[PDB]
């Protein structure tokens, strides 16, 4: 065993999320999504992926991923990947060198462009071997980034690079095909590896998902915004620390129960957390042991949606919550008497409910939770250490336990939950919705604690409960889960490729399916500026009434858009007409402005998905690659 | 029980006329009562007036716009002492309305043992029977002692509703201690026959009424908690108590039988006036309470006290074949507004995105009940036909402040020809 | 060994002594239909000496079973011609305890 301190379950501290090897690529990708520089973005992307025509950054990426996911690659695979790298680098160098010459021949540039695209397409499948997919899904990603960028620039510089109109149309078709095929293959690899690791243990799947949230999914989301110009590239995925024993979780059970228990109230701030602690040393031979029996996270104090994840019972007298005051701690002390001996060892049995409210600044920034294992005649004993922020919640009575620092620079603790242990996870799937139904699951023990960290770009929503708009910014992205209120029979769907913590699945067969979002304006905001809304939805089944985006403000209800909903398994973007905030009757004092996305009632077995909203000025927005020309 | 009896008397002899008084100034509205008659069977429990309007009535109503689909009872029988005669206990009642909602919980106690093995290992526990045997050397007869703890289940009949019941309780004295025996039968399904001997029947029936709700009252526990939490939605409608020893059955008049069956208000061409109670809604906003306003001839009113987003209430409307859509109509809204609302109240018509504004009314501070009349409209202006299945009438207002609320009672829909105000209310 | 049958402390009181305690538990599964009632029996078997004062032989046997590194047991007890205990866990082969010229004196 090891008594050295730990860092998010790792023996040595981990790299900050902003200091990983794929950070400048993502930063320039966001900068280019904001405003694309024609016939020049591909050179910068190439300089950032292959600096100095060297594959050293990709090897750094491979080493970091191998460090994170505890999976290493054989030397032969490394040599093969480096050979493919050099093969791509040769043609990329030829093309980039021929571009920069002032007055080059455009047909030669066309030939080099075709050569480079073909070489990238040819060498892509080397990173799609499933036996190593969990390690290569990162690398593969960047390679697609090098291709989809290329084609994009090629569509912008037509006759400048010797392209006819049919050339540009063929390139647009190839782009509209590949931007779906690459996403499909990346999601295949992710889901395969994630389901496999979760069937092994939940902790390993959480680790793989934490890796993909930093190295894979942000770029997959950036791919879906390259056809536009002016939108914001922002990720809101959470990083999940798991501390406890191993629990196998099916992929049907993850998306139907476990993730819903981990999120809880997806639009509420954590206000209190309660733990069910048990300590006992009644047998004189068995050393002392400690048990975590259940976790209860309380968000909205006046709602009552989230319940216990494990077991909130402390005794068998049925006297839990009665006679005004609720029970808090039960301590039984037993004494013995030996005639042949003199020392007396009193035995203690404690069952209590530890309570931890949120700090003065609403959120915990870090935690120090750890668990210690022990063996004793083929039986595992446990010891726990719990500390949230500066409040020591539980010091181990079974001896000192090394600290395990749970922290991420630029992240804050948003949710604290657990996973049921020893019980079937195949029930209450169709009942666990976003509202109304009780978010709970009964299990004798959990023996695990799961902490979710959210990026600081979401800190304002969970504090003010509304989306504030500034005049200085140009683009705003609103995740679906950051709503004011939602309709009934709505589910949380895990769509990590959207760079968000999920999407909303509407499947209510009565009244309507509606989702509202609260908007507020800061002082100095221009209300005469023209804006537009973009809605990202997936509609597998036809809706005769279509989708409707509406603006509601103290009864001044105006219709912003009505879109025909046809059957389509892929993701679709609906753009509204231009509008100004004076046409909506909203000023700096309006506190009940709302954006509502609504649709009629569905039928049995039907649903439709909502992902995110994009609000951008009319001047800074322009569609460059047509999606209908497939 | 005595308060319930007095309220049952006032629902038939007092409150309908009090409601009729408030409609004499108009001409053409409908006089219709929807109050319920409550049968109480069990022991006596004192209830404060603060506790009635803050907890007990909310537990009796449950989901105020849903049909009763199942009812579960926690039954206990024991005769372990050889001297004490057999006894039976009702430990808790669980009425289940919407199966997919999960709002109503146990009114008493749903536990059957102390093994913590209630709902686990797939199948839930249903019955526990312990049989004890003794052996006496001087005697020969053996009297096995039984201890049964089970969960009786009764689903709704094929016709959705129970029409009557036969519930009764028998008392017995034994050394200054009261023993009980129970007999439960809902409709034609015998739910519980008494093991402690025959019990005379107690017919619970009212010609022209049907069983809509079955609940209980907590016994032996304080009723002064969770008042501000027991709302119409979201929060769990439950209260923990070791026993109840009481069953309360609510009968509703047959004029409400169509709503709890079709979940929508159907309109006919032949009728002239329609009255819609506030509690017969499709969906309601959060932080809304059920207020007992029996003088309105309805089972209550909606108290809005949500200090965020908005306060909204929607009602589903459907049209029968042969309905004229060119006929002009009007809406009358009955509201009580103790605190001023700068945005006022708003009546809106929503139909598959064809949202039209029917009325906006200035809300001034007034402790009395007020009627707001909208302008005339036709169903062609609302875009509603005989095939529309998502038509909705929405009464809405902005968010409130701390300590504020406003009350909504009922809606009146009447043709323009048959409506006329005769006595002016502003000339006071 | 242990003469206790429950944890109510009501062993030998109220004239007659306790003899047998049987707890039957019932479940209810929505997805399934068969119901398997679970039994828990704790009793005191009594065997007096025969008319000829002594037992001459016995048929006592025990059956072992393994289940996830845990041993389960089944018992069969018969003294003389009186069947004291037939195994509920299935049939158990007989184990004849007898010696020609000997009689059972102590158990």
Numbering used by the authors:
A (entry chain A): 14 to 643
B (entry chain A): 216 to 643
C (entry chain A): 323 to 429
Lines from the paper:
Cry11Aa and Cry11Ba are the two most potent toxins produced by mosquitocidal Bacillus thuringiensis subsp. israelensis and jegathesan, respectively. Cyt1Aa, Cry11Aa, and co-crystallized Cry4Aa and Cry4Ba. These are produced during sporulation and are remarkably stable in a variety of conditions, but dissolve after ingestion under the high alkaline pH levels characteristic of the larval mosquito midgut. Solubilized protoxins are activated by insect gut proteases enabling binding to gut cell membranes, subsequent oligomerization, and ultimately gut cell lysis leading to larval death. Cry11Aa and Cry11Ba structures maintain the three-domain organization characteristic of Cry δ-endotoxins.
We first tampered with the interface enabling the brick-wall packing of Cry11Aa tetramers (interface #2) by introducing a F17Y substitution, intended to induce electrostatic repulsion with the negatively charged D180 (distance D180(OD1)—F17(CZ) of 3.3 Å) due to deprotonation of its hydroxyl group upon pH increase. As expected, crystals of the F17Y mutant were found to be more sensitive to increases in pH, with crystals starting to dissolve at pH as low as ~9.5 and an SP50 of 10.6 ± 1.0. The dissolution profile of F17Y crystals is again characterized by a reduced slope, as compared to WT crystals, explaining that the plateau is nonetheless reached at the same pH (~pH 11.6). Nevertheless, the result suggests that dissolution of Cry11Aa crystals can be accelerated by separation of the tetramers associated through interface #2. The F17Y mutation was also found to challenge crystal formation, yielding crystals far smaller than their WT counterparts. We note that F17, D180 and the H-bond between them are strictly conserved in Cry11Ba; hence, the importance of interface 2 for crystal formation and dissolution could be extendable to crystals formed by Cry11Ba. To evaluate the significance of these changes, we characterized the distribution in size of crystals of Cry11Aa-WT, Y449F, F17Y and E583Q using AFM. All three mutants had a significantly reduced volume compared to WT Cry11Aa, due to a reduced thickness of the crystals. The structures of the other three mutants were determined, using the WT structure as a molecular replacement model for the phasing of diffraction data. We found that neither overall packing, tertiary structure nor interface formation is affected in the tested mutants at neutral pH.
